Design a protein around this ligand. Structure first.
Ligand SMILES: Nc1ncnc2c1ncn2[C@@H]1O[C@H](COP(=O)(O)OP(=O)(O)O)[C@@H](O)[C@H]1O
Ligand SMILES: Nc1ncnc2c1ncn2[C@@H]1O[C@H](COP(=O)(O)OP(=O)(O)O)[C@@H](O)[C@H]1O
Ligand SMILES: Nc1ncnc2c1ncn2[C@@H]1C[C@@H](O)[C@H](CO)O1
Ligand SMILES: Nc1ncnc2c1ncn2[C@@H]1C[C@@H](O)[C@H](CO)O1
Ligand SMILES: [Mg+2]
Ligand SMILES: [Mg+2]
Lengths: 228, 228
């Protein structure tokens, strides 16, 4: 019925930029942005849990992983009831997914000792159960991978200018890069979700300026979508 | 259909002791123990997240609150499919509830500055949403309150002999006592769950030795249950 695509990529690869092009291309196409704005002012002022994690990751990574994933799931669940329920060829695009939260971000942070065994066990337990409940509902038909070098992404952090991201070192970006390449390019990353091994993927090199690349990328997305 | 009763009480008031009397009284009566054994060895060795919270509550209270509540919900959800689905007068007893997790334990820990505003906001958000999904399903028909002085409870901690609880001071027990009295005796505690204001409650003084009190308590429970 509703085709579900996630857009995956490193920090500042250019997902929000890409996503802001999608709705213009068909009235049947909808989008679920990643709620990064919510993470900088936690509401039911507020805690900036994004800042707290980056400033003290071995203290705040679990708390962040818990809130980020949750807020994403709710945003995505919220989209399953919308103008799409009446569109001819509905396509819902997710900015990242529950799988990147876990297999890219939470995993990298555990491996870095920003989460300990206890945190990692609780988080994966929580994540297994969250998904077992909201399973078939959020399953992907396709992934679009926006591939950019960690060095391009480091530059784009600077361009975008979120205060909380300005201290992010290349090393952190590089670890996240190789995780994405493993999952989506080489397809060597194993997950607890077997259908993901089969899921079609479109990889788009977005190292060059968006304005010049815009049209070819759009062709590739329309082609890719027609084959699902 | 299935009457749902929670058993509420301070640490070592005598809930497991009480609960181990329930099934004997009718084949239609089932029980969901609080998974404290899981909390001392976190599994998907293991982290003893019970110990971690008590040793460093301002570090581990949120993580514990998250895992404890979750593990309780799953245990309770698991019981809604069981021999009860075919019993004549099924009564399911919960050892504590999602409401004590929040309004007694998590609340006391926030008020003590063991959780900060950010943790407390994330936790309540999480708890609101968890309950909005698994709402009507876990709603209570009745509460049984096992009332014991914090000084009786301090003595019973010593009798029971869990290593992780041996350092618990009277002051912590006293704060939890007055919270229980507020919610269940004076009924002055306000919650985000309006039906709870109406929920019938049976208060049992369990300061005296269980063996002598056993029979009167059993009479009061059978009476109380017949009136729901
Ligand atoms: N292909 C591109 N060419 C030039 N700038 C880009 C490109 N993609 C993204 N940007 C810019 O880089 C910054 C990060 O982009 P953004 O879309 O916020 O990335 P993400 O959503 O993946 O974190 C923004 O300043 C955006 O304008
Ligand atoms: N009424 C009672 N009289 C004597 N001992 C009790 C009584 N209730 C509980 N106990 C004992 O006190 C300790 C704590 O009881 P337990 O049932 O584990 O409490 P809870 O489950 O509420 O934490 C145990 O050693 C138990 O044997
Ligand atoms: N799950 C996550 N863990 C850590 N960082 C995340 C996660 N999801 C998204 N991000 C990062 C946080 C912020 O730097 C960037 C904004 O899109 O994405
Ligand atoms: N939610 C909770 N938070 C802190 N302590 C809790 C919670 N639920 C139960 N307990 C305590 C932990 C342990 O000391 C005792 C065992 O029944 O109950
Ligand atoms: Mg973005
Ligand atoms: Mg007990």
């Amino acid at each position: 019925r509703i085709k579900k695509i996630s857009i995956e990529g490193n920090i500042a690869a250019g997902k929000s930029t890409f996503v802001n092009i999608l709705k213009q291309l068909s009235e049947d196409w909808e989008v679920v942005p990643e709620p990064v704005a919510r993470w900088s002012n936690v509401q039911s002022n507020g805690g900036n849990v994004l800042q707290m994690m980056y400033e003290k990751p071995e203290r705040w990574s679990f708390t962040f992983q818990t809130y980020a994933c949750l807020s994403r799931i709710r945003a995505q669940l919220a989209s399953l009831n919308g103008k799409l329920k009446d569109a001819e060829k509905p396509v819902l695009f997710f900015e990242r997914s529950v799988y990147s939260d876990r297999y890219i971000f939470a995993s990298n942070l555990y491996e870095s000792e920003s989460m300990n065994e206890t945190e990692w066990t609780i988080y994966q337990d929580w994540h297994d159960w969250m998904n077992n409940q909201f399973g078939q509902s959020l399953e992907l038909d396709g992934i679009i991978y926006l591939q950019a070098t960690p060095e391009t992404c480091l530059h784009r952090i600077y361009l975008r200018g979120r205060n909380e991201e300005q201290g992010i070192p290349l090393e952190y970006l590089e670890k996240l890069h190789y995780k994405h390449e493993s999952w989506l390019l080489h397809r060597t990353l194993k997950t607890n979700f077997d259908y993901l091994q089969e899921v079609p993927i479109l990889t788009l090199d977005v190292n060059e300026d968006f304005k010049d690349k815009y049209e070819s990328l759009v062709e590739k997305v329309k082609e890719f979508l027609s084959t699902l």
